[PDB]
Amino acid sequence: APDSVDYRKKGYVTPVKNQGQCGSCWAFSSVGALEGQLKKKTGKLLNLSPQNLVDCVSENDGCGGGYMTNAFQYVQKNRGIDSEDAYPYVGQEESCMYNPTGKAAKCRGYREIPEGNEKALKRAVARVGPVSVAIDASLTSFQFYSKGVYYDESCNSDNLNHAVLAVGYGIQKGNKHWIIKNSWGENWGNKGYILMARNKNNACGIANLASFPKM
Protein backbone atom coordinates (compact mmCIF):
# COMPACT_ATOMS: atom_id res chain seq x y z
CA ALA A 1 0.00 0.00 0.00
CA PRO A 2 1.12 3.62 -0.56
CA ASP A 3 2.52 5.57 2.39
CA SER A 4 -0.34 8.09 1.98
CA VAL A 5 -3.85 7.89 0.50
CA ASP A 6 -6.58 10.57 0.41
CA TYR A 7 -9.71 9.75 -1.59
CA ARG A 8 -10.97 13.32 -1.24
CA LYS A 9 -8.35 14.25 -3.84
CA LYS A 10 -9.68 11.55 -6.17
CA GLY A 11 -13.30 12.71 -6.18
CA TYR A 12 -14.55 9.77 -4.10
CA VAL A 13 -15.95 11.86 -1.24
CA THR A 14 -19.08 14.04 -1.06
CA PRO A 15 -19.33 17.14 1.14
CA VAL A 16 -19.56 16.80 4.90
CA LYS A 17 -23.12 16.29 6.16
CA ASN A 18 -24.82 17.03 9.46
CA GLN A 19 -26.79 14.25 11.16
CA GLY A 20 -28.35 16.73 13.60
CA GLN A 21 -29.55 15.25 16.88
CA CYS A 22 -30.41 11.88 15.37
CA GLY A 23 -28.01 9.07 16.33
CA SER A 24 -27.73 8.10 12.70
CA CYS A 25 -23.99 8.29 12.24
CA TRP A 26 -24.08 4.61 11.20
CA ALA A 27 -26.26 5.63 8.26
CA PHE A 28 -23.94 8.47 7.27
CA SER A 29 -20.92 6.16 7.57
CA SER A 30 -22.60 3.51 5.43
CA VAL A 31 -23.67 6.04 2.82
CA GLY A 32 -20.15 7.46 2.66
CA ALA A 33 -18.64 4.05 1.97
CA LEU A 34 -21.27 3.35 -0.69
CA GLU A 35 -20.59 6.74 -2.29
CA GLY A 36 -16.89 5.89 -2.61
CA GLN A 37 -17.61 2.53 -4.20
CA LEU A 38 -20.19 4.08 -6.53
CA LYS A 39 -17.59 6.55 -7.79
CA LYS A 40 -15.06 3.77 -8.24
CA LYS A 41 -17.44 1.45 -10.11
CA THR A 42 -19.38 3.89 -12.30
CA GLY A 43 -17.22 7.02 -12.35
CA LYS A 44 -19.93 9.27 -10.90
CA LEU A 45 -20.14 10.82 -7.43
CA LEU A 46 -23.65 11.15 -6.00
CA ASN A 47 -25.04 11.94 -2.55
CA LEU A 48 -26.83 8.87 -1.24
CA SER A 49 -29.68 8.89 1.29
CA PRO A 50 -28.91 8.20 4.96
CA GLN A 51 -32.62 8.74 5.66
CA ASN A 52 -33.36 5.68 3.48
CA LEU A 53 -31.23 3.61 5.91
CA VAL A 54 -32.62 5.24 9.07
CA ASP A 55 -36.20 4.53 8.01
CA CYS A 56 -35.83 1.14 6.33
CA VAL A 57 -33.08 -0.90 8.00
CA SER A 58 -35.39 -2.63 10.48
CA GLU A 59 -32.39 -4.61 11.76
CA ASN A 60 -31.11 -1.32 13.18
CA ASP A 61 -32.59 1.17 15.63
CA GLY A 62 -32.91 4.38 13.56
CA CYS A 63 -31.86 7.46 15.52
CA GLY A 64 -31.10 5.11 18.42
CA GLY A 65 -28.10 3.55 16.71
CA GLY A 66 -27.21 0.73 14.36
CA TYR A 67 -24.58 -1.30 12.52
CA MET A 68 -23.12 -0.54 9.10
CA THR A 69 -23.13 -4.24 8.25
CA ASN A 70 -26.94 -4.34 8.63
CA ALA A 71 -27.15 -1.23 6.44
CA PHE A 72 -25.10 -2.77 3.63
CA GLN A 73 -27.09 -6.00 3.73
CA TYR A 74 -30.34 -4.02 3.58
CA VAL A 75 -29.17 -2.19 0.45
CA GLN A 76 -28.24 -5.56 -1.07
CA LYS A 77 -31.56 -7.30 -0.26
CA ASN A 78 -33.53 -4.18 -1.28
CA ARG A 79 -31.68 -4.07 -4.61
CA GLY A 80 -30.79 -0.43 -4.04
CA ILE A 81 -30.46 2.74 -2.03
CA ASP A 82 -31.97 6.10 -2.98
CA SER A 83 -30.13 9.31 -3.76
CA GLU A 84 -30.33 12.00 -1.08
CA ASP A 85 -32.41 13.96 -3.63
CA ALA A 86 -34.99 11.16 -3.85
CA TYR A 87 -35.15 10.51 -0.11
CA PRO A 88 -34.15 13.67 1.79
CA TYR A 89 -32.66 13.64 5.32
CA VAL A 90 -35.04 14.97 7.98
CA GLY A 91 -33.21 13.87 11.15
CA GLN A 92 -36.02 11.79 12.65
CA GLU A 93 -37.03 8.19 11.97
CA GLU A 94 -40.15 7.90 9.81
CA SER A 95 -41.98 5.15 7.94
CA CYS A 96 -39.93 3.56 5.15
CA MET A 97 -40.49 5.45 1.90
CA TYR A 98 -37.92 3.83 -0.36
CA ASN A 99 -38.63 4.69 -4.00
CA PRO A 100 -37.07 2.48 -6.69
CA THR A 101 -37.31 5.31 -9.24
CA GLY A 102 -34.75 7.21 -7.15
CA LYS A 103 -32.28 4.31 -6.90
CA ALA A 104 -28.70 5.62 -7.10
CA ALA A 105 -26.54 2.69 -5.99
CA LYS A 106 -26.54 -1.06 -5.35
CA CYS A 107 -24.65 -3.32 -2.98
CA ARG A 108 -23.45 -6.92 -3.23
CA GLY A 109 -22.93 -7.33 0.50
CA TYR A 110 -19.93 -6.32 2.59
CA ARG A 111 -16.52 -7.34 3.91
CA GLU A 112 -15.19 -6.93 7.44
CA ILE A 113 -11.70 -5.89 8.49
CA PRO A 114 -10.10 -8.28 11.03
CA GLU A 115 -10.81 -6.84 14.49
CA GLY A 116 -8.12 -4.51 15.81
CA ASN A 117 -5.83 -4.80 12.80
CA GLU A 118 -4.75 -1.34 11.68
CA LYS A 119 -2.46 -2.80 9.01
CA ALA A 120 -5.40 -4.63 7.43
CA LEU A 121 -7.40 -1.41 7.66
CA LYS A 122 -4.65 0.52 5.86
CA ARG A 123 -4.47 -2.13 3.14
CA ALA A 124 -8.26 -2.06 2.72
CA VAL A 125 -8.39 1.72 2.47
CA ALA A 126 -5.65 1.59 -0.19
CA ARG A 127 -7.25 -1.28 -2.15
CA VAL A 128 -10.94 -0.48 -1.83
CA GLY A 129 -11.60 3.18 -1.08
CA PRO A 130 -13.26 4.86 1.94
CA VAL A 131 -14.03 2.38 4.75
CA SER A 132 -16.76 2.58 7.41
CA VAL A 133 -15.39 2.53 10.97
CA ALA A 134 -16.66 2.87 14.55
CA ILE A 135 -14.76 4.74 17.26
CA ASP A 136 -14.98 6.06 20.77
CA ALA A 137 -16.03 9.65 20.06
CA SER A 138 -17.38 10.32 23.55
CA LEU A 139 -14.57 12.45 24.96
CA THR A 140 -14.34 16.20 25.52
CA SER A 141 -11.19 16.31 23.38
CA PHE A 142 -13.05 14.83 20.42
CA GLN A 143 -15.96 17.27 20.69
CA PHE A 144 -13.63 20.26 20.65
CA TYR A 145 -11.05 18.93 18.19
CA SER A 146 -9.61 21.63 15.93
CA LYS A 147 -6.30 20.61 14.34
CA GLY A 148 -3.48 18.07 14.50
CA VAL A 149 -3.39 14.33 15.01
CA TYR A 150 -6.04 13.42 17.56
CA TYR A 151 -4.87 11.38 20.52
CA ASP A 152 -6.49 11.15 23.93
CA GLU A 153 -4.98 8.89 26.58
CA SER A 154 -8.48 8.07 27.85
CA CYS A 155 -10.02 6.93 24.58
CA ASN A 156 -11.90 3.66 25.03
CA SER A 157 -11.48 1.02 22.31
CA ASP A 158 -14.39 -1.02 23.72
CA ASN A 159 -16.74 1.97 23.70
CA LEU A 160 -17.56 2.12 19.99
CA ASN A 161 -20.29 4.74 20.19
CA HIS A 162 -19.88 6.62 16.93
CA ALA A 163 -19.59 5.68 13.26
CA VAL A 164 -17.45 7.65 10.83
CA LEU A 165 -15.65 7.21 7.52
CA ALA A 166 -11.95 6.60 6.92
CA VAL A 167 -11.27 8.34 3.59
CA GLY A 168 -7.49 8.03 3.72
CA TYR A 169 -4.37 7.91 5.85
CA GLY A 170 -1.06 9.67 6.05
CA ILE A 171 1.40 11.43 8.28
CA GLN A 172 1.67 14.93 9.68
CA LYS A 173 5.05 16.02 11.08
CA GLY A 174 5.97 12.38 11.79
CA ASN A 175 2.61 11.60 13.38
CA LYS A 176 0.77 8.89 11.48
CA HIS A 177 -2.97 9.32 11.09
CA TRP A 178 -6.29 8.25 9.63
CA ILE A 179 -8.25 10.84 7.67
CA ILE A 180 -11.75 10.70 9.13
CA LYS A 181 -14.94 12.22 7.68
CA ASN A 182 -17.47 12.95 10.44
CA SER A 183 -21.18 13.81 10.09
CA TRP A 184 -21.49 16.64 12.62
CA GLY A 185 -21.41 19.38 9.99
CA GLU A 186 -18.59 21.52 8.64
CA ASN A 187 -18.46 23.67 11.78
CA TRP A 188 -17.16 20.74 13.80
CA GLY A 189 -13.48 19.82 13.83
CA ASN A 190 -11.46 20.77 10.76
CA LYS A 191 -14.20 21.64 8.29
CA GLY A 192 -15.93 18.45 9.43
CA TYR A 193 -12.82 16.25 9.40
CA ILE A 194 -10.48 14.90 12.06
CA LEU A 195 -7.04 13.28 11.76
CA MET A 196 -6.93 10.36 14.21
CA ALA A 197 -3.80 8.65 15.49
CA ARG A 198 -2.74 5.65 13.41
CA ASN A 199 -0.61 2.72 14.66
CA LYS A 200 -0.97 3.95 18.23
CA ASN A 201 -2.35 0.71 19.68
CA ASN A 202 -5.63 0.98 17.81
CA ALA A 203 -6.44 4.34 19.37
CA CYS A 204 -10.18 4.84 20.05
CA GLY A 205 -10.90 1.39 18.57
CA ILE A 206 -10.51 2.65 15.00
CA ALA A 207 -9.92 -0.84 13.57
CA ASN A 208 -12.37 -2.72 15.84
CA LEU A 209 -15.49 -2.46 13.68
CA ALA A 210 -14.45 -1.58 10.14
CA SER A 211 -16.34 -2.68 7.04
CA PHE A 212 -16.97 -1.76 3.43
CA PRO A 213 -19.62 -2.60 0.81
CA LYS A 214 -19.10 -4.86 -2.19
CA MET A 215 -20.36 -3.41 -5.45
Domain total for the chain? Answer: 1
- Three-class SS state of 177: strand
Q: What is the largest CA-CA distance in the chain?
A: 49
Q: What's the length of the chain?
A: 215
Rounded to 10°, the helix 68-78/25-42 angle is: 50
- Residues 154, 180: contact at Cβ < 8 Å? no
CA distance 158 to 89: 30
Non-local CB neighbours of 68 within 8 Å, separated by 6+ positions: 26, 29, 30, 33, 110, 132, 134, 163, 209, 211
> Nearest 5°: phi and psi at 121?
-65, -45
The technique is X-ray
Look up residue 66 and give its amino acid: G
Resolution for the entry shown, Å: 1.6
DSSP string, 89-123: --SS-------GGGEEE----EEEPPTT-HHHHHH
Closest residue by Cα to residue 136 from 114, 112, 122, 152:
152
The domain that holds 215 is classified in CATH as 3.90.70.10
CA distance 40 to 2: 18
Catalytic residues: 25, 162, 182
Q: Give the domain range for residue 152.
A: 1-215
